[PDB]
Amino acid sequence: DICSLPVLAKICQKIKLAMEQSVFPTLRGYHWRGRDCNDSDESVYPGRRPNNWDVHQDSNCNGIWGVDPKDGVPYEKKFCEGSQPRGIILLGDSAGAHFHISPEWITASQMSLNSFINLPTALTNELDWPQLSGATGFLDSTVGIKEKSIYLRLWKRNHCNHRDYQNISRNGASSRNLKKFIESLSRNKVLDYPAIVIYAMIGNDVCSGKSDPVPAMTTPEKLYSNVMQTLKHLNSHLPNGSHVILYGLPDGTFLWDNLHNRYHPLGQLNKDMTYAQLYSFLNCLQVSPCHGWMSSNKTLRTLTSERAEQLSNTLKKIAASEKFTNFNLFYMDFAFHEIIQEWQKRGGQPWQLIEPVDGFHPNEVALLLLADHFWKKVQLQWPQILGKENPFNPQIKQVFGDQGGH
């Protein structure tokens, strides 16, 4: 742990404090879940069915409230009843939370006072940027692609979903440890709308830093056990009519193939450090996020991809056979090959889909392309998951505008 250094004592203590004052406390700030419009009343929060149609107070924080003076009808009843609102919930890892170290913080050739203005906020959020993620991002993308997050596409299809997002993701989350924070999931069987739940543990079950990482990887038997516990738990907390989507794992050999010859941001000035040298350095120290895939040992990379395929098939098999009363289940290939193809159709290179500093995570472009593939594949094969477009979307915007923002 870095905080063992005495010189870092004060900043480590102040980071801990800021996290505690957010209201796993960070998981409640508006970067991770829809802003609570009234934190002095615990019956007001995003995702609940409206209390008395919100004739006085906006009880689900979606910016729709009050009564139409023409016909005395509540706007929430006129505009949202029948539209079948639903929330988006991600159970994820450092990719779902969009872990990101800015190259601007470590590349001297363009460094300035402007470069570190976003550092304190990133540090109090564990270097995660869920407000820009593919699942729950709501801010304007800092990159040049029109694609939006799953949450915003959901809002676009039905404006009543405003603020109904939850990113329940942790760096280092896996099928093994998800039970340690799944309690931060907020949803009430009886009072809340159904939710779309994405289960995206896409790495840490085969990713480890140990010198011999094969024994540490989860087995298909243990994974099946872990996921069934998680699904049994979700069945006791999701309203009837929910949907759960299990993501498969990636063929992580694209990392080494596309990056091993490229210069890291710290090596671009003097062309003296490639991703291969970084991977070797981190493995020698046993602190690589993924020894299995971030390695020159082609045998080890194959054993990792082989286990990831077995784990993926387990999830696919769980989705075809296991049944639950309160939600139906779906399986989705990570399918990064198709992401690469779509990027190349836009003129892009595959190496531009990886976070430059860590050489491991998908960056913002990739997360938005994964969200676009999710949307098109779900809309084509399982349209019920996403519901119908709300005919009153234009009238919602005309009466309520931006619905309070985020």
């Binding site: 063992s4 004060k10 900043i11 001297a108 460094m111 003296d272 450090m273 350095f281």
Partner: protein, 118 residues
């Protein structure tokens, strides 16, 4: 205590200090002061930056000024510790001169203490 993470962190910071001096063609001292001036006062970042210059600055200057790379520096200051038997972890290519002799030089450069701090 020193571990794998402290080693990554030392190599990172020293590399940035080294490259900031190179980009502005300045002393290491002016490079560290420039880096600390870039950091916000929030969360004690700028303050911590100045605690690090105080505790480690003179030796980072002595070593970088002898054209030692960030690997050498962090091994000399014990953020990176190579257990006897275990292999050597280095991010940058091993210098022209042999490592064992490069590290002996480095240790002798910081053993000299012509200046006392009260």
């Amino acid at each position: 205590l020193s571990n794998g993470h402290t080693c990554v962190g030392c190599v990172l910071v020293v590399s940035v200090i080294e490259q900031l001096a190179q980009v502005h063609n300045s002393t290491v001292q002016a490079s560290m002061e420039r880096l600390c001036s870039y950091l916000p006062e929030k969360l004690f970042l700028k303050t911590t930056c100045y605690l690090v210059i105080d505790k480690f600055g003179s030796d980072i200057i002595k070593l970088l000024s002898a054209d030692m790379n960030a690997d050498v520096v962090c091994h000399t200051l014990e953020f990176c510790k190579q257990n006897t038997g275990q292999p050597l972890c280095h991010l940058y290519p091993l210098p022209k001169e042999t490592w064992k002799f490069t590290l002996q030089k480095a240790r002798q450069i910081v053993k000299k203490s012509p200046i006392l701090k009260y």
